[PDB]
Write a protein that binds this DNA or RNA. Structure first.
Ligand SMILES: [Mg+2]
Ligand SMILES: [Mg+2]
Ligand SMILES: [Mg+2]
Ligand SMILES: [Mg+2]
Ligand SMILES: [Mg+2]
Ligand SMILES: [Mg+2]
Ligand SMILES: [Mg+2]
Ligand SMILES: [Mg+2]
Ligand SMILES: [Mg+2]
Ligand SMILES: [Mg+2]
Ligand SMILES: [Mg+2]
Ligand SMILES: [Mg+2]
Ligand SMILES: [Mg+2]
Ligand SMILES: [Mg+2]
Ligand SMILES: [Mg+2]
Ligand SMILES: [Mg+2]
Ligand SMILES: [Mg+2]
Ligand SMILES: [Mg+2]
Ligand SMILES: [Mg+2]
Ligand SMILES: [Mg+2]
Ligand SMILES: [Mg+2]
Ligand SMILES: [Mg+2]
Ligand SMILES: [Mg+2]
Ligand SMILES: [Mg+2]
Lengths: 78, 167, 300, 158
RNA sequence: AAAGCGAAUGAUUAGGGACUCGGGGGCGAUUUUUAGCCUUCAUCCAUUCUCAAACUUUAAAUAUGUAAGAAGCCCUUGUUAC
RNA sequence: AGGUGUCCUAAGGGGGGCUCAUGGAGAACAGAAAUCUCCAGUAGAACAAAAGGGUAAAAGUCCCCUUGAUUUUGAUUUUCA
RNA sequence: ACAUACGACCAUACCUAGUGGAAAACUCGGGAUCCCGUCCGCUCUCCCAUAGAUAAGCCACUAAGGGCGGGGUUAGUACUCAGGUCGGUGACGACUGGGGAAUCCCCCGUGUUGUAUGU
């Protein structure tokens, strides 16, 4: 449990830093609408919280990894 | 023919965009109360941008609206600073106009060092009588094509009333 | 430069709303709940009391819904209130009480329940509802109807509840509560019961005249021009409306005649045909194009 | 592979083109009695009292009436036998059926048409019969001279 | 199934007209805040060449629910706590 | 080609006012992008999440009051004997 | 026939631009003590029906208007159900007994109607 939970914690942090590059650069944000922009940052707000909490397990952290990825990938693709 | 097609001032609304929340904004709202005599209303930032250092749901501006003779008087003070000279591009296709002033104490408020210095924005709305048709709740409709103001008409009204000039 | 949003494809995909919603006269969301009835009771009708306010009139009707349209049971306006001794303030709140009372008495006599269900018969600012009247060694339930307010905002003291109050005192049963009547204080959740009585007989407009006369003579003269000409004073307002109530119950079918020009039903049809316009025929419409072509070609 | 309650109903339950929005209000003013013939047609907008996708298009007989719904009896075909089914449908989905109107029209017409003959005294031949072969007639060629036809030769269009 | 794209969503080939301050490269002194003179993409408008199992304004053939009465139709008037 | 072992005292229930995404033209610092005003705008927005259906004086949005997410047992529909 | 209130079908009724409107009605309009609601009597709510005006809403008419509705054409074409020891190396096609569509393009039309009161 100690190792399994700790592995998922790093991967969730990696993607949050990863998506910040897309939203920061002007080239990709130029053609992407606000309505998609504010929905990503809204999802990022509660992501920050559960790292601080200690009760989160592998299942909860892994679920929001794909939930955040699924949300952002729909905007860029179309 | 011109029985009921005479222009008038519908309302004048003027705002200050301080751009950042805190005690500074509260002082700006304090300034605006005595200018109009009415309590002002705050505004919230709907975007969230790091370049300007603002987020969502934070107050960044204030504004207030006035109507009737009070709007007529306050508009006169603003044009005095502008010495009744406006640029032709200040009039929109609808028939409205506005301007801004850098210094709020250029007209007298008996300057106080505590409140500070702010820059204010001016805007007013023209109209014709019987425009309630588009705003009543019951049987709302749309006004006709011949009964709406054009750009040329409002500048003619401005020059004839205030004896001002357009550049 | 951007897309022209209103192109030929935009019109084709456009779906228009109901005709009476385009004009903004009805609210179908609220209408559905008013007219539908439980399928257990098959053909028992539902009676509505509609109230509409114009600039210079008040309209009241009794309506039942049908599959091919509405049916009107009894109607009462504010024009007919002139025959009972009222000529001014036809749209104040008190005038609503009078026309509300006229319709309630007018409908009961239509279906033969006028002798019973007399009502209060002496207006008072009390919250009461019509109850069953004992007769022939039995109990008969009163006539029931509901209120249709249309698009008017239902705030405290609005005139829409005045017609509701007036018809309730007539004898008809209309379920309601007292928290919207004037004189109701939301803080103490209590009804004064005396402001309502004063405010029924035109007391509120009576206090306006005396207050306005002292403070502003010229304004008081302009607003009440027609009151002064027929020398009706503030003291006489209460006795004026109280006498009007007596004549409503005595004879609700008294006929009123206006001063507008009058003709027979058929002569009006002939008069209107004079000003009608005739559509252009196909041959005439085609001929104009050649004339338009010839002069436009010759213009340049 | 899944089997949900509304699976496969992408086009069945959808409203048509240029028909979204307000429900025509004459629907709620109809009346029903037991023994009437009604047919089911599901409306997408109303999500309460909606029957299963099997009954969308079947016809049944009313057997119960309540505040805002009717009970219909329909016959379902399981393999090798029929079963009686009883469903509850909101009135936004049901509709009176013209299936039996031809019969009800004909019985009224027959009774009155038979009455007049019995007073008069002539046989009627009231019951219907299928279409019969045509009878002999004559066709004239005055000012209607026939025109001769022939097949056409091959030719390339494009 | 067929059909449709000078009809929505998605894919796609080519010229023409209108525009300069959208980007790029010049010219009369690269004078240039010259809406000068050039022009290459982009944009907008009227046309043009081909497509869609998870697209659609339209829409078959074959198959499919119900009905074709005596337990029916019409007139008169008893029961009840609905 | 994709989804589920969750999440919510409101994101549940009732009522009332308002209209969204986006585009054109304007206003001191202010710019591609901050706040204010008018006109156009059939949903091209929003509705916890996969996909499909549905919704404009609303089912979206803000405001006011609340706990039908309660008690006693039967009949019916879908997978199906 | 015309107007108003509550409706039915829900564009033949919508959208853009231009002219005309007897009678009454509808509308714009005037005022801010009282009931009630706002940053602001703009909206909502109260009081007046005198005065001013058909400028707008509303009604009617006009446009080789866009759209929508009905029809002709495309066409007995595309497709399809049944049949043969039918053609063809195959791809696929013709014939016999039946059912039978949809664009481009061309023509016409521009709301009908129920209950109550009144011009
Ligand atoms: Mg309501
Ligand atoms: Mg209560
Ligand atoms: Mg399946
Ligand atoms: Mg369907
Ligand atoms: Mg449910
Ligand atoms: Mg195909
Ligand atoms: Mg097609
Ligand atoms: Mg396409
Ligand atoms: Mg395309
Ligand atoms: Mg090109
Ligand atoms: Mg398909
Ligand atoms: Mg059949
Ligand atoms: Mg799979
Ligand atoms: Mg709630
Ligand atoms: Mg709600
Ligand atoms: Mg609501
Ligand atoms: Mg949708
Ligand atoms: Mg199975
Ligand atoms: Mg007149
Ligand atoms: Mg005019
Ligand atoms: Mg056709
Ligand atoms: Mg055809
Ligand atoms: Mg074959
Ligand atoms: Mg026309």
């Amino acid at each position: 449990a100690f190792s399994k939970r700790f592995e998922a914690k790093q991967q969730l942090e990696s993607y949050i830093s990863r998506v910040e590059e897309i939203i920061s650069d002007p080239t990709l944000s130029l053609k992407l609408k606000r309505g998609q922009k504010d929905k990503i940052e809204q999802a990022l707000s509660e992501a920050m919280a559960q790292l601080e909490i200690e009760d989160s397990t592998a299942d909860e952290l892994k679920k929001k990894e794909l939930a955040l990825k699924r949300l952002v990938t729909k905007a860029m693709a179309s | 023919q011109n029985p009921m097609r005479e222009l008038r001032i519908q309302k004048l609304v003027l705002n200050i965009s301080v751009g950042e929340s805190g005690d500074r904004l509260t002082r700006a709202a304090k300034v605006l109360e005595q200018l109009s005599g009415q309590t002002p209303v705050y505004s919230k930032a709907r975007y969230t941008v790091r370049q300007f250092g603002i987020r969502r749901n934070e107050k960044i501006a204030v504004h207030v609206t006035v109507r009737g003779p009070k709007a007529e008087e306050i508009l006169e003070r603003g044009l005095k600073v502008k010495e009744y000279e406006l640029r032709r591009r200040n009039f929109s296709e609808t028939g409205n106009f506005g301007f801004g002033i850098s210094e709020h104490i250029d007209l007298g408020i008996k300057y106080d060092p505590s409140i500070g210095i702010y820059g204010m924005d001016f805007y007013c709305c023209m109209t014709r009588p019987g425009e309630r048709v588009a705003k009543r709740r019951r049987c709302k409709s749309r006004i006709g094509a011949s009964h709406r103001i054009t750009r040329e008409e409002t500048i003619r009204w401005f020059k004839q009333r205030f004896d001002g000039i357009v550049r | 430069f951007h897309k022209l949003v209103k192109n030929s494809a935009y019109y084709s995909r456009f779906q228009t709303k109901f005709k009476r919603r385009r004009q903004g006269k009805t609210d179908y969301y609220a209408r559905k709940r008013l007219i539908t009835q439980a399928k257990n009771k098959y053909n028992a009708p539902k009676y509505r009391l509609v109230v509409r306010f114009t600039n210079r009139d008040i309209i009241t009707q009794m309506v039942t819904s049908e599959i091919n349209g509405d049916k009107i049971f009894a109607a009462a306006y504010s024009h007919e209130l002139r025959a009972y001794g009222i000529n001014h303030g036809l749209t104040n709140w008190a005038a609503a009480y009078a026309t509300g009372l006229l319709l309630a008495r007018r409908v009961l006599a239509k279906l033969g329940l006028d002798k019973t269900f007399t009502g209060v018969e002496e207006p008072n600012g009390e919250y009461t509802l019509t109850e069953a009247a004992e007769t022939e060694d039995g109990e008969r339930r009163p006539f029931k109807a509901i209120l249709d307010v249309g698009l008017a905002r239902t705030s405290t003291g609005a005139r829409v509840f005045g017609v509701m109050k007036g018809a309730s005192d007539g004898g008809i049963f209309i379920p309601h509560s007292e928290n919207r009547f004037p004189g109701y204080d939301i803080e103490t959740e209590e009804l004064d019961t005396e402001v309502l009585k004063k405010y029924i007989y035109g007391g509120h407009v009576a206090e306006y005249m005396e207050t306005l006369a002292d403070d502003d003579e010229e304004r008081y003269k302009s607003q009440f021009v027609k009151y002064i000409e027929d020398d009706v004073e503030a003291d006489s307002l209460e006795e004026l409306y109280a006498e009007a109530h007596k004549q409503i119950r005595a004879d609700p079918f008294r006929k009123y005649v206006s001063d507008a020009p009058k003709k027979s039903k058929e002569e009006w049809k002939a008069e209107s045909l004079k000003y009608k316009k005739a559509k252009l025929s196909r041959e005439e419409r085609k001929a104009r194009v050649e004339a338009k072509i010839k002069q436009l070609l010759a213009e340049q | 592979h899944a089997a949900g309650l509304r699976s496969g109903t992408r086009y069945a339950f959808s409203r048509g083109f240029r028909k979204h929005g307000q429900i025509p209000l004459s629907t709620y003013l109809r009346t029903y009695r037991v023994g009437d013939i009604v047919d089911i047609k599901v409306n997408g907008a109303v999500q309460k009292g909606m029957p299963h996708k099997f009954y969308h298009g079947k016809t049944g007989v009313v057997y119960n009436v309540t505040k805002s719904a009717v009970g219909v009896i329909v016959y379902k075909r399981v393999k090798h036998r029929y079963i009686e089914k009883r469903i509850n449908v909101r009135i936004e989905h049901v509709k009176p059926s013209r299936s039996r109107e031809d019969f009800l029209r004909r019985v009224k017409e027959n009774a009155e048409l038979k009455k007049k003959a019995k007073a008069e005294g002539v046989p009627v031949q009231l019951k219907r019969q299928p279409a019969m072969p045509r009878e002999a007639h004559t066709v004239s060629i005055a000012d209607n001279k026939p025109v001769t036809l022939a097949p056409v030769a091959y030719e390339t269009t494009i």
